[PDB]
């Protein structure tokens, strides 16, 4: 599992893991950091799976063509080398692991198959397909066989498909994609027919892998395989005596290998991403670093110039390339993992008989066809959100503070926290993230399984189904308003509220919801939660005037639905109202809302009058006898003053201290009564004065002069001199702390981590271990700050030992952060008014 201050890596079990640890022992002799090598079944499967759930190696290695997908489905960080660095490497090898612009992972190698043969059984090897029965049938007479290597795997086997006149790829535009018209053509039927053939005639066996394929040519049973450089180690010791040569041609025309590069991708949930890039680039793609795997398992040919100039003298290498000169480049496109399936299973069904050859390549091509539409799809809408966020993005830099903090959809879990829950338990500490603005994406409702996950309010089971693949619920869906009607034609779903009156269907059953909200009446329904052929419907129905969401019981009341579709339902009463003094909506372009975050608000003022109280929503020039309700959003008010900024145009004319508040609860708001005399002005702040967090850093920190991580500056124990460059938006005198805060989470359900019934209860714990400066004078604009400052050892380590004492098994630690962070009175904005 990933943790701070450590590596782990995953890679291929045909590929030289063990000459990879080799260089990860190395790195950890010089630099302190461990590094682990892993091999997992199935890896580029389960790399997705595990790393959407924020967990997987920070390492992976693929050929190129999956890290496309990962990229997409944000599973992968951007690398940053530098162009010195680009430039160690075959400039064309780049172009591999670069997706939509950008640079998503480390090439390392260009592999290609080739023909593998026994010059003891066959001197001369056939250069065509066609040879292959006869001289199996020859060979066949002292217990021989011609050619055997993997039928399981396309990778291997669509290159004698596509041989006769077929690119399975085509350019399309500005990039390598998929081929959908002519993949069931006479030369694709031609070459899977050859093959089918060759099965049916007892030349090849349907059921041969990749390990049988091996061990009959390593044993001397075969006097051919197929297969990648990564097999010649094997080959050589078992002393067979062998050459590498080009892949045989059919109907006179080349097989061309699918052309891979063996490639380094970061995963986006790794907290050690400095360690991985200085692992990859210092270590890993150095001549010593490549000739130790290299040297378990053959890499092809490599992407660093220094070492390939080596290699490429190797004639089993220049057959490599000359194969991979013949190939076919593989795109790196999402819809890489949907080609594959289509014609793995086109493969393997027409070979065991499943289906004829040209339904196997009718169903092929239909799949592919499915594949591309869908991604036309996408790229239209991934090209609205781009657009709609760009505004929103352009509107933050024209009219936000510039050190401004703005956070979207171990944090993680905190956010799925705020966002997925509801209550007291959804009220997170945005204000330890000196957090400013929030943005809201209404679209992230088709996301909504993952964040209900990882803030804890469904199980493993409902957010993505069990071993089998059952169990999975929808936990949001929209609902557009059309008349009287509410209406989701995908999913089937119709509410009908004509008639002063509500029916839901789903597809032809009517179904009743667990309750019903209409807002902004209030009014509430409470039904049985099925439908009426008795099967259950555990949902609740909110409508509002614009739109309609059918929720997942458990996320009934998720704030994310509160701040993207208008529904105040809350199990606390005054919850919503509250929230809404903390979260402001300050823009809205398409579906991106960008609402101002502060921890301080007021909700509501009543003023005195006659007598008798009322709400008021704006204030005159004059004396007002006040009530302040307050809105205290996951942190308390301690020690704070409570001014009237009087404002005219845009520039504060007088600050007026109207109350001070030792203490509010952030869980027990109470209302503050005020007497105030307000001078003219064309509107009134409510400002709160208290400490909290102050600056942005802008560069990683250093400390005695080496590049560190902001969010761990120092081990437990270390100590040095700290350098710091800091911005502020206005002068403050603060003091500097070192700030540990620990994400984890606790288990809540099920029998054990693993157990489906499993859901997990995030937490954050912040605290402040050392004052390492005092009255640090901070002005506008930039900042460099330089203090000697230790972190005790036992600090770390004793808390995380404290919180196994009290969770046991059901911990789960996601995150610890050892940040520097600067304090001062800092003003946090509760309300704006205006006078009249
Ligand atoms: O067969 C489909 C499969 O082909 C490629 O995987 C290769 C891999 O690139 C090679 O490094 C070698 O290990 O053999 C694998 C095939 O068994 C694609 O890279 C992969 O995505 C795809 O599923
Ligand atoms: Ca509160």
Partial sequence: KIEEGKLVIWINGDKGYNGLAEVGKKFEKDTGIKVTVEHPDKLEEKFPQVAATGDGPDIIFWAHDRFGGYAQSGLLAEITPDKAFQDKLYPFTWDAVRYNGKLIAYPIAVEALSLIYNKDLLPNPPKTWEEIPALDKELKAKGKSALMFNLQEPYFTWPLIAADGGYAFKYENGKYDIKDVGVDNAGAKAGLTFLVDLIKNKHMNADTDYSIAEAAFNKGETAMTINGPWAWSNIDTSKVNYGVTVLPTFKGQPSKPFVGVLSAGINAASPNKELAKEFLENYLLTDEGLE??????????????????????????????????????????????????????????????????????????????????????????????????????????????????????????????????????????????????????????????????????????????????????????????????????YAKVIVDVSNSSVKVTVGDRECDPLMVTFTPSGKTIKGTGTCSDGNAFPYVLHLTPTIGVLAYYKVATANFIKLAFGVPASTIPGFSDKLFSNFEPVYESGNVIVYRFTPFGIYKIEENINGTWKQVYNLTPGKHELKLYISAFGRDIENATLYIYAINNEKIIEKIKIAEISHMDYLNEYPIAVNVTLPNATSYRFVLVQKGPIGVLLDAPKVNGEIRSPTNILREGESGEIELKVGVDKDYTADLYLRATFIYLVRKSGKDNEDYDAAFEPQMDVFFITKIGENIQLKEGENTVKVRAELPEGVISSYKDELQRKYGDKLIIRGIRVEPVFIAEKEYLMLEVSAS
């Fill in 292 to 489: 130790a795997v290299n040297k378990d398992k053959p890499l092809g040919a490599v992407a660093l110039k220094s070492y390939e100039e080596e290699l490429v003298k190797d004639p089993r290498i220049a057959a490599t390339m000359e194969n991979a000169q013949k190939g076919e480049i593989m795109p790196n496109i999402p819809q890489m993992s949907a080609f594959w399936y289509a014609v793995r299973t086109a493969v393997i069904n027409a070979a065991s008989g499943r289906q004829t050859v040209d339904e196997a390549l009718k169903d092929a091509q239909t799949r592919i066809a499915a594949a591309k539409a869908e991604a036309a799809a996408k790229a239209e809408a991934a090209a609205k959100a781009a657009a709609a966020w760009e505004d929103a993005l352009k509107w933050l830099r024209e009219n936000t503070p510039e050190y401004s903090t703005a956070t979207s959809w171990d944090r993680d879990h905190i956010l799925a926290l705020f966002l997925a829950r509801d209550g007291n338990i959804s009220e997170v500490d945005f204000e330890s993230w000196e957090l400013n603005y929030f943005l809201v994406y209404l679209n992230d409702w088709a996301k909504f399984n993952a964040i209900s996950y990882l803030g804890g309010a469904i199980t493993r089971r409902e957010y993505n189904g069990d071993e089998s693949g059952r169990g999975a619920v929808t936990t949001l869906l929209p609902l557009p308003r059309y008349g009287e009607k509410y209406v989701n034609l």
